[PDB]
Design a protein around this ligand. Structure first.
Ligand SMILES: CCC1=C(C)/C(=C/C2=NC(=C\c3[nH]c(/C=C4\NC(=O)[C@H](C)[C@H]4CC)c(C)c3CCC(=O)O)/C(CCC(=O)O)=C2C)NC1=O
Ligand SMILES: CCC1=C(C)/C(=C/C2=NC(=C\c3[nH]c(/C=C4\NC(=O)[C@H](C)[C@H]4CC)c(C)c3CCC(=O)O)/C(CCC(=O)O)=C2C)NC1=O
Ligand SMILES: CCC1=C(C)/C(=C/C2=NC(=C\c3[nH]c(/C=C4\NC(=O)[C@H](C)[C@H]4CC)c(C)c3CCC(=O)O)/C(CCC(=O)O)=C2C)NC1=O
Ligand SMILES: CCC1=C(C)/C(=C/C2=NC(=C\c3[nH]c(/C=C4\NC(=O)[C@H](C)[C@H]4CC)c(C)c3CCC(=O)O)/C(CCC(=O)O)=C2C)NC1=O
Ligand SMILES: CCC1=C(C)/C(=C/C2=NC(=C\c3[nH]c(/C=C4\NC(=O)[C@H](C)[C@H]4CC)c(C)c3CCC(=O)O)/C(CCC(=O)O)=C2C)NC1=O
Ligand SMILES: CCC1=C(C)/C(=C/C2=NC(=C\c3[nH]c(/C=C4\NC(=O)[C@H](C)[C@H]4CC)c(C)c3CCC(=O)O)/C(CCC(=O)O)=C2C)NC1=O
Ligand SMILES: CCC1=C(C)/C(=C/C2=NC(=C\c3[nH]c(/C=C4\NC(=O)[C@H](C)[C@H]4CC)c(C)c3CCC(=O)O)/C(CCC(=O)O)=C2C)NC1=O
Ligand SMILES: CCC1=C(C)/C(=C/C2=NC(=C\c3[nH]c(/C=C4\NC(=O)[C@H](C)[C@H]4CC)c(C)c3CCC(=O)O)/C(CCC(=O)O)=C2C)NC1=O
Lengths: 49, 161, 160, 146, 161, 161, 161, 160, 160, 161, 160
């Protein structure tokens, strides 16, 4: 990326974290107010691959 | 995933070859069967639910499988089983449209054998559920499409056993 | 292909192919026979297209075949036409499938990084592709020449 | 604890009676109760024991009654109805092609009442009706379900 | 996880058995000890920190373990160790309330032996930390509950060795 | 490997300590249960074959596992499976004599989970085969030895899951 | 390994199915091409050495590969390379007789990609050596057998890339 | 098969098939339709062969269906004939393959260990297997009955 | 160290070190010999420093060494000075590293939980550290005494 | 990770030792080479792109690797490869500044050998790409720093082989 | 131990333990209480046994504490008694287990190579052990003194 404001922009670690968090999928299931939880066996349809 | 056509393109791309006569003949062999694949998919899709019901009736229910101690005992597990059946039917319809089984490996078979071993899901009984849906499908789609639909059900079932 | 861009899309929502969605799977099938034919025609004249593209290129941009040019010399020029042969091949692939798909994975994603390393001037590669459009297009009927032309202009677009 | 086990005893002890009362009450044209392999609204438009059902259709219909009863005893020991709503939540559709849904409710209605005669309604007579109410409630509507 | 009431149901469900007399007797044997389990949990919870402190004092600290070269040397590792201790105490309290050790397997023991081998965490020393907390617990909870609390500490400790 | 006694000796050797009161108490706790361990081993050894037979009958055969598509289909694989069963029984008998599970790690569990994943061997089904042999063993060996035999079967089974 | 006749049996055995109409049709599709496979194998075997010689001449030698710094420089490595070539030719002839590529996976491809990476053996150059032998083979065996021989050379070459 | 057994010899010596190896594949495949007919006839009469085999077996050795017998009872008997059904199936496989590879991996390697565990009396089982030969052989022409008979006698041989 | 801290920030942003980061490594390393001298002096007087901190502590808090005090008695006092010896050691480490990474992982992260368990009054441990600052600082030149003092005040800060 | 200085601190911390003469001598041996490490890093960083281009030119491209069938064929994979190269260069520069290879293990080598085996990435070819960048680096940084930069490139390359 | 030895022989044969080796264990269990007691007794007088062993040794072999002797000097003698303390400890371990086992791995396998390097005269180490037997044996009842004596004579044997 580069450093933009105070910095830590498109980081390595920093970029990865925004990318996750700003994803479509993230803000759908847990969008906005909920803390993330394991979507394991009981909760959703699990992939078998 | 890949279909008939991209199977050929990627096989030539790795050699960096323009498509030659042998390639062009393969692609023709796909295009020439294409209209029939479409008609067959429309029959399967629109009879989806009836195919599952007739396949379950011939190969799963009225049995120890649906009784206490059986893996499709409980409304929960009965629902999971016919849910699975719908996956198989639906994906086999994709494979047959694509004219390539690669999607059945990527999105259905990978890890499924062990997943079923881990839950206790009876493999042999599931294969019969696949080969019963094939039987029904082959009646509904007719001479034109019977053999072509059938193979991807057979792909599915030798993928588990 | 058109198919790939398509069976995978009606599987992200867990459903069967939509009745309108089996119609793009219809135009392409009719188109494919014509599409296959155009690719074969392009394949037949490949050596002529590349060579005449290469002359058209070096007139328009003589700097790449000059002292401080990426393609300066006989074997720096040989590799340059080979790259032009690569892209014409990918253009035949794109036409036949009906969707660009495989060409992207084969020759544009990563192309900036590859050529920046080699220090190849990207925009003059885009010119080499325009030059191939001009030659290839003169060996095709009006209707087929346009259909081919979209794929040439895509590659020109992606190197940008 | 101690009640529930006693309350569940009673239901188990004379389980068949509760079932026979239902079995007899919807199946007219023979003895439904001979079939059950232990012995080994509108609502009725009474199925016949050999004419509309057959033997094999009948056995499924008889087992369910017994099986339906069994689940409440399991359900009773645990805190709730979870083992009853979950297995009955979409039961309507699996059953309807060959079972009259509304006919089946009357056996369930009957059982709840017939289950209660056993209790002296201290609190445990209320209970048995409460668990069996779930099967009926959650079954009908048939839009809400599944 | 499962508890005594739940285990009786799943153990019978797999056989498709109504609860019968033998089942009903087991469940009574749980219910009849239930009030005592609750009182014992309230003592453990409210003395949690003191139990860890007295258990560490008898079985861990004032030793080579807390000295340079020892696994509970550094404030980091001392903190991790008494953190662990709190897990054990807390889960044993769950197991004892449930009257079933299954939670100790599912959420505590599974993989823990090898996790400790991989980090170098001394197993024998950890067992003594478990059996010291048991000793303290058995004093605090009294005649009523002593034997019942004790067994799930013993379950934990033979799970590591 | 190590047993109860060498577990203590090596724990003190690394500290260069002569055996003290705490050590001597541990060793007594082993010696005092020793005669009972021996009697239990003689029952298991002499009923070995019957324990496997009854454990397979309750937890493996009469099932999809033994049918085509199942992992214990073919005389080859049926033989391999009950061969395995004999290993488990035999080693658990060693662990229980030694009063230490270390041999179950060194010579049985190490790599076994992945070995089974690689061959397709159903893990959950194997655990049931272990916990069925435990059930039989606990009847045959009696009050004296039941709890002590049982733990090393439980060690084995949480080692796979 | 498996062949078309054998694969049909094991694919059905895992489902516990008698051979049925679909199975019987597959086996016929093999038997009906059988005589042609045999004739083709006799041509390849008896021209083995000439096929390697012509394939090397079109795709390997007269190049940097055979010059100092090249992987088939030294009589040692030149010998190893055409030794390999003979393996490929010979096994492809087995696969084509069997009408199944499974032997090419079991006894040729497994680990070979990494073996070549570890020695430095040029993969792309080896593929050209495979596709040149195919070219020669397809001339020698004629219309009858050309497509059928060809596929197992193509199996080999997409197995490396 | 003959193919599996033989090709294996080819690959192991790093070579194409011999004239001999090619000849036997040719003679073998010529004998295909007949072998398929032999399997069909026996598949078509499987229930009869098993049942009549089972009577012939229990006369020649009944004790197995008696108080202290391995096959005593209705469901301990439902398993002994089922095993006889298994072996007839494997015999049909062997006949169409022209050797035992399949018969062997599926039902003789490990069979001593399996049956010793079950304490089914194995040697009684050989006699039971022998009875099936007698029944099956009475539904086949002289020539086909012999060809079938080799595979029955193999299983009888392997047991013991 | 200063090195570890600079690098970790570099790697985490996927980049080479900044001019700033490079400058501080340079200034830091120039102070190497001086920092090593500061650690030596304090290592050389460790036994004296611990005792004078310990006297300063027990005057200011005679209670800790009183009936209901955490450090009451001869061996509850012996362990208390040993802890004071521990922290002086960590302070010498910090001074030679030029930051707290080592000081932190070894003796502040988890220190609240450790001492709360032992029921040690944390703020009187902070006093014991101030007492050591006072003694250690009287054995160092003005400039070196300040440089040392930052690390003492850090520990005092972290126990808070 | 650790550097020269924290390597020493942690080695003494586990013994609970104040730094002694031997320790102080080691740290001096680092500080005394420190200014030179910084200058070398500024040369590498500012010539990063040219080092990769000259290293690829001597050891990777103009070859079968970049041709169809080769692992750095396709703009995608060519980009991935020189991306990797930049990692190596950048991390080696970290290791050399730190005067400790531990970061090369923690953040680069761990699992990388098998990752490359799993994708098919040619190991020997990657090592040559590392040892070519070293060659270029050693020219650019000069007498002062050549040996010190070089070792962490050599650490990287014996970490893969 | 006796347990380890019995089991290892059992497992090597891959068959459950016998009668004849499921006995010795019973004897050992009864013996172990007595064995544990002897080790405790030996442990109590360790300092006296070592010191008096050390006097008995240097009278019998004054050459090791002489100009060209391995144990010449106050330390070189201090380390020598420490080694005598090591072996007495291992002897208590051996007695308690009932089998020598761990002592071998701890202090005889490799002992020739260790002491040859240090240039220690092995046979005078064997004498130091005899000297310890004499002292230890005078603090034990006749029966317990013999049982202990076997383990002393083993070590004496292994240094040979
Ligand atoms: C404990 C919660 C629970 C229930 C009740 C349950 C029922 C259940 N009923 C079934 C079928 C059936 N059930 C019935 C009949 C009836 N069912 C009734 O509850 C009525 C008394 C009667 C109609 C009047 C019939 C006729 C079938 C055959 C399916 C078909 O229509 O083909 C099946 C399919 C397998 C089978 O044939 O047994 C299930 C899984 N599953 C569960 O987990
Ligand atoms: C998109 C591709 C895809 C497939 C195919 C798939 C299968 C699949 N089947 C599952 C369970 C199951 N599958 C079945 C299937 C059956 N029961 C029987 O007795 C019959 C033999 C059989 C039906 C014919 C049952 C009963 C379960 C539930 C097991 C349980 O109770 O946990 C699960 C576990 C998670 C869940 O319960 O949903 C998966 C992932 N998942 C996927 O993502
Ligand atoms: C290097 C990181 C590190 C530190 C600092 C550390 C401290 C530490 N201090 C301890 C005890 C102690 N520490 C103190 C200290 C004090 N009493 C007071 O009132 C004063 C406030 C304070 C002296 C300034 C006392 C009195 C004990 C004994 C407490 C007990 O035994 O209950 C113990 C338990 C005894 C032992 O096993 O060593 C540890 C581990 N351990 C570590 O790994
Ligand atoms: C919820 C169930 C659960 C448990 C029980 C659990 C244990 C556990 N203990 C750990 C480490 C540890 N465990 C200890 C424990 C001890 N040190 C000693 O010397 C004593 C013998 C012993 C305390 C009595 C120590 C010191 C570490 C740190 C090891 C390290 O430095 O990496 C870790 C590694 C991750 C971490 O450091 O937090 C886990 C996961 N994790 C879980 O999720
Ligand atoms: C001394 C300690 C030790 C153990 C425990 C051990 C286990 C082990 N089990 C194996 C295979 C196997 N293990 C089983 C086991 C089972 N099949 C089932 O369906 C059941 C769930 C289960 C029996 C309860 C089977 C069927 C195979 C054969 C897999 C194959 O066909 O390759 C193999 C592969 C080599 C072989 O086939 O013999 C090993 C090494 N090996 C050892 O050295
Ligand atoms: C350093 C180890 C080494 C050796 C020796 C070597 C020899 C070698 N000799 C060759 C050809 C040849 N070599 C000869 C040699 C002879 N013709 C005769 O009749 C005489 C007996 C003999 C000369 C004394 C001939 C005639 C050819 C051409 C054969 C052909 O093209 O078919 C070739 C193939 C052409 C090429 O690509 O270079 C190689 C590799 N390669 C090596 O790596
Ligand atoms: C296809 C390869 C193959 C074979 C052959 C096979 C046999 C086999 N026979 C079995 C039992 C049995 N088999 C028999 C057979 C006999 N009793 C007698 O006395 C006679 C000698 C003989 C009949 C001719 C009996 C009586 C049992 C029941 C034994 C028991 O339950 O203890 C069982 C255990 C029951 C089960 O789970 O299915 C298997 C797996 N399994 C296989 O995978
Ligand atoms: C199919 C996807 C694909 C492409 C396109 C590709 C291109 C490619 N072009 C290369 C070189 C080159 N390519 C060119 C091309 C040009 N010079 C100019 O100035 C013009 C702008 C342009 C011609 C139009 C030149 C001059 C070189 C040599 C550069 C060097 O050696 O430094 C190389 C390195 C040489 C080699 O090992 O092959 C690759 C891999 N590789 C691929 O996998």
């Amino acid at each position: 990326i580069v450093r933009g404001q105070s910095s830590m922009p498109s980081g390595g670690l920093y970029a990865l974290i925004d990318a996750l968090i700003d994803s479509e999928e993230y803000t759908s299931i847990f969008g906005e107010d909920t803390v993330p939880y394991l979507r394991n066996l009981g909760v959703e349809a699990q992939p078998s691959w | 995933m890949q279909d008939a056509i991209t199977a050929v393109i990627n096989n030539y791309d790795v050699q960096g070859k323009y498509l030659d006569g042998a390639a062009l003949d393969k692609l023709k062999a796909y295009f020439t069967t294409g209209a029939v694949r479409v008609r067959a998919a429309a029959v399967i899709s629109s009879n989806a639910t009836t195919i599952i019901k007739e396949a379950a009736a011939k190969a799963l229910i009225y049995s120890d499988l649906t009784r206490p101690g059986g893996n499709m005992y409980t409304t929960r597990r009965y629902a999971a089983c016919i849910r699975d059946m719908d996956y198989f039917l639906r994906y086999a319809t994709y494979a047959m449209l694509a004219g390539d089984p690669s999607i059945l490996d990527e999105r259905v078979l990978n890890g499924l054998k062990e997943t079923y071993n881990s839950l206790g899901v009876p493999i042999a009984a599931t294969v019969g559920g696949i080969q019963a849906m094939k039987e029904v499908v082959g009646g509904l789609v007719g001479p034109d499409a019977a053999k072509e639909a059938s193979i991807y059900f057979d792909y599915l079932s030798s993928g588990l056993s | 292909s058109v198919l790939t861009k398509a069976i995978v899309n009606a599987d992200a929502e867990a459903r069967y192919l939509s009745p309108g969605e089996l119609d793009r799977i219809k135009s392409f099938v009719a188109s494919g026979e014509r599409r296959l034919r155009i690719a074969q025609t392009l394949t037949e004249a490949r050596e002529r297209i590349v060579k005449q593209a290469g002359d058209q290129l070096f007139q328009i941009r003589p700097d790449v075949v000059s002292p401080g040019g990426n393609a300066y010399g006989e074997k720096m020029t040989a590799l340059c036409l080979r790259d032009l042969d690569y892209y014409l091949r990918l253009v035949t692939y794109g036409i036949v499938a009906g969707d660009v798909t495989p060409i992207e994975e084969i020759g544009i994603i990563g192309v900036k990084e590859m050529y920046n390393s080699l220090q190849t001037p990207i925009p003059a590669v885009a010119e080499g592709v325009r030059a191939m459009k001009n030659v290839a297009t003169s060996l095709l009927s009006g209707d087929d020449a346009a259909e081919a032309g979209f794929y040439f202009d895509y590659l020109v677009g992606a190197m940008q | 604890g101690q009640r529930r086990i006693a309350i569940v005893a009673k239901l188990t002890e004379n389980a068949e009676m509760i079932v026979s009362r239902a079995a007899n009450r919807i199946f007219v044209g023979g003895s439904p109760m001979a079939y059950s392999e232990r012995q080994k609204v509108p609502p009725d438009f009474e199925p016949i024991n050999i004419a509309r059902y057959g033997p094999e259709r009948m056995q499924k219909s008889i087992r369910d009654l017994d099986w339906f009863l069994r689940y409440t005893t399991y359900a009773i020991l645990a805190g709730d109805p979870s083992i009853l709503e979950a297995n009955c939540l979409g039961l309507r559709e699996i059953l309807e092609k060959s079972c009259s849904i509304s006919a089946t409710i009357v056996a369930l209605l009957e059982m709840r009442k017939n289950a209660a005669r056993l209790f002296k309604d201290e609190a445990d007579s209320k209970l048995v009706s409460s668990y069996i109410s779930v099967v009926i409630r959650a079954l009908d509507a048939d839009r809400s379900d599944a």
